[PDB]
């Protein structure tokens, strides 16, 4: 339920409020409040404090960037209480060492990548040009061109001198190093002519395209021989530096984040000229620790824990879930949506009340339940390993508390799933082709089943009736909660709207079961007339022109409950057809392909279960969020968020 979130007023000195802010950040269980304009200053405390906070924030950003360059991640742990100068001295040394090592490793990798392409070509060009490199007669433009279209480039060389303008490729058969040697200026004009024919000389980077080709190939072979050992040494040094300094950087960044959060929270204070005001909101379940922290002031400097506002107009005040531990695990799926208006109803119990009972009616396969039990054992072993739920495939990093809540929800769902699957009387599709443990009236072999789930002459009508009954009960619960919240918030429009929607739905269901359903339309004729009159009376008392579309939308939300029975029967029919085809082509085909046919049928059934059960389990919670939330509103102002001080640890 929505907690109190009661207010907390406090008055202190400037430095005493700094101490009390450090206390209330260590006791970080109260969201803050500015309240600056009410006859006080804005607590622009000090530009020296602003500069020290900027220095600590730069230290924290440098610690984050140093963990990033070292490869470490933002792993929260206990802080390191030390001076800011000592923190800078600890941080900047390893940060500078890692930055220099990373720059050297990137430069060595770029040098190796550049040397991997022009090692053999520059060496071949220098080998052909072993005496003609830099003597001041003629340039030799080597162009790394394509395969043997050497006459298309040599057209310009034939336009040049006869027994010279040697434009050919002696070696480097992959990328043909077409050396063209004519002159200096005449070969520059011929290089312009070859570029007009389409050409590009080997203007390499570094010292390769900035020195003579013999020294270029020599430095290329030298860098090629030096790059691998230097890159491996840089990788080993980076790994050793990260493994040696990651814990110190993490503790330093934790203390830096703590002090920076203290500075940013003290920025949101209210100072009173060597006095200071403080305003917060904290839940009722932590009032004792708040009073114990407030007693730890200078002389318990004058504060008060005052009450929060009522159901009317609590806008900036946040709320909380506050569920029991048997129902606490659905709080994540509850918080996937928005928050309530601190007086709006918490429908989080309806999730654990209705979603597993619907999912067990959907998933009646006890082999799928055993696979879910094995997957829950795997998730329980992963949570016992206490690692982060890390999947680089999905790029999903989830907390271990999230995995534990998911495992608890999976166990609570698997209980009702096994219950309704034994009520369905089906296991792994159908092992009943071999071992008919669920007895049928058509095939009496063992103890009976409640619903055979392959029969539909009576089971389908009863299943549709039970699903429609559960859905109409949930719709009536949503309309009743809407009218109750309209009465509790003193909003008679919402209460009259819920009453009129309930009366219209009751009259519509009565008229349906009278005219289109069974006989004896006399006892319910006045009931349908009363439902129509109640809808018309609430329309007249509302006068909001809430037309027939709202009633038809409520009718569709009620009728959506048969989709659960449809999905359960569809999954059951698919699993029964798959198990029947496997049993036929395994046992009825000689009973010798029992193992191979059973394995192929199990692979196909696992693929079909992975393809279908995700959407099948998704549609229950989707229909629940579509029906119960929208019948209760749940899209009005989205609540206010509870954000106390961190003490991130």
């Amino acid at each position: 339920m929505i907690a109190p979130m009661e207010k907390l007023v406090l008055a202190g000195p400037k430095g005493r409020a700094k101490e009390l802010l450090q206390s209330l950040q260590q006791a970080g269980v109260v969201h803050l409040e500015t309240l600056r304009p009410e006859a006080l200053s804005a607590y622009q405390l000090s530009p020296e404090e602003r500069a020290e906070l900027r220095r600590w924030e730069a230290v924290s950003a440098g610690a984050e960037h140093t963990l990033s360059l070292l490869g470490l991640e933002a792993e929260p742990a206990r802080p390191f209480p030390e001076g800011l100068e000592a923190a800078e001295k600890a941080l900047s040394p390893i940060q500078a060492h890692a930055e220099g090592l990373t720059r050297q490793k990137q430069e060595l990798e770029e040098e190796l990548a550049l040397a991997q392409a022009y090692l053999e070509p520059l060496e071949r060009l220098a080998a052909l040009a072993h005496g003609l490199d830099k003597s001041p007669f003629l340039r030799v433009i080597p162009f790394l061109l394509t395969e043997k279209e050497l006459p298309l480039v040599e057209e310009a060389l034939r336009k040049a001198l006869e027994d010279r303008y040697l434009l050919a490729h002696e070696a480097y058969a992959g990328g043909v190093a077409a050396l063209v040697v004519v002159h200096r200026k005449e070969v520059d004009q011929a290089k312009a002519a070859l570029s007009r024919a389409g050409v590009a000389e080997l203007r390499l980077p570094g010292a390769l395209g900035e020195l003579p080709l013999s020294e270029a190939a020599r430095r290329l072979k030298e860098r090629a021989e030096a790059a691998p050992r230097e890159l491996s040494e840089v990788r080993q040094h980076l790994a050793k530096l990260a493994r040696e300094s990651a814990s110190t950087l993490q503790s330093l960044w934790t203390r830096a984040q703590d002090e920076v959060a203290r500075l940013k929270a003290l920025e949101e204070l209210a100072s009173g000229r060597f006095g200071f005001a403080l305003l917060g909101y904290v839940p009722v379940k932590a009032k004792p620790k708040v009073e114990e922290a407030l007693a730890r002031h200078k002389e318990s400097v004058v504060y008060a824990f005052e009450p929060v506002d009522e159901h009317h107009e609590a806008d900036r005040i946040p709320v909380v879930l506050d569920n029991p531990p048997w129902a606490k695990p659905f709080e994540l799926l509850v918080s996937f949506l928005n928050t309530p208006k601190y007086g709006t109803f918490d429908p989080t119990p309806v999730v654990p009340v209705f979603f597993p009972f619907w999912f067990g009616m959907i998933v009646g396969d006890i082999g799928y339940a055993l696979l879910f039990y094995l997957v829950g054992r795997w998730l329980s072993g992963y949570v016992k390993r206490n690692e982060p739920l890390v999947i680089d495939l999905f790029a999903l990093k989830l907390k271990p508390q999230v995995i534990g809540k998911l495992v608890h929800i999976l166990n609570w769902m698997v209980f009702w799933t096994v219950v309704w699957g034994v009520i369905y009387g089906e296991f792994f599709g159908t092992f009943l082709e071999h071992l008919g443990v669920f007895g049928t009236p058509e095939h009496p072999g063992l103890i009976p089943i409640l619903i055979h789930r392959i029969d539909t002459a009576k089971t389908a009508n009863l299943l549709i009736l039970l699903s429609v009954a559960f859905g109409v009960v949930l719709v009536f619960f949503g309309l009743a909660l809407r009218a109750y919240l309209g009465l509790k918030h003193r909003h008679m429009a919402h209460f009259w709207e819920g009453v009129g929607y309930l009366g219209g739905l009751v009259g519509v269901l009565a008229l349906a079961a009278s005219y289109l359903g069974n006989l004896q339309a006399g006892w319910l004729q006045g009931l349908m007339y009363l439902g129509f009159g109640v809808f018309l009376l609430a329309v007249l008392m509302s006068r909001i022109w809430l037309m027939i579309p709202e009633i038809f939308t409520q009718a569709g939300h009620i009728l959506s409950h048969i989709r659960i029975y449809a999905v359960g029967a569809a999954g059951g029919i698919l699993a029964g057809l798959l198990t029947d085809v496997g049993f036929a082509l395994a046992e009825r085909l000689g009973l010798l392909g029992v193992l191979l046919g059973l394995l192929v049928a199990g692979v196909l059934h696992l693929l079909i279960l992975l393809l279908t059960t995700l959407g099948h389990m998704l549609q229950p919670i989707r229909l629940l969020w579509v029906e119960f939330f929208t019948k209760f509103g749940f899209y009005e102002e989205n609540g206010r968020p509870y954000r106390p001080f961190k003490s991130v640890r």
Binding site: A555, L559, V626
Partner: protein
């Protein structure tokens, strides 16, 4: 059965098929604009699913008429 049962079943099947065709036709552009608003903002999901599931009433009425036909069957 006879001959009228199969013809009524054929008509109910064509009804359900064309109603699902119209429902998917509405849901295509509905979910297109909804996923566009979802990529625009994550705070619009509270009405996106409502506007998406607003078109299922035709499928619900077609299922009601098909159940009336199966009762007539």
């Amino acid at each position: 059965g006879g001959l009228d049962r199969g013809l009524i079943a054929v008509g109910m099947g064509l009804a359900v098929g064309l109603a699902a065709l119209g429902t998917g036709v509405a849901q295509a552009r509905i979910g297109a604009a909804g996923v566009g608003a979802i990529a625009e903002d994550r705070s619009n999901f509270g009405t996106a699913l409502i506007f998406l599931l607003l078109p299922e009433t035709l499928v619900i009425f077609g299922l009601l008429i098909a159940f009336i036909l199966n009762g007539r069957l």
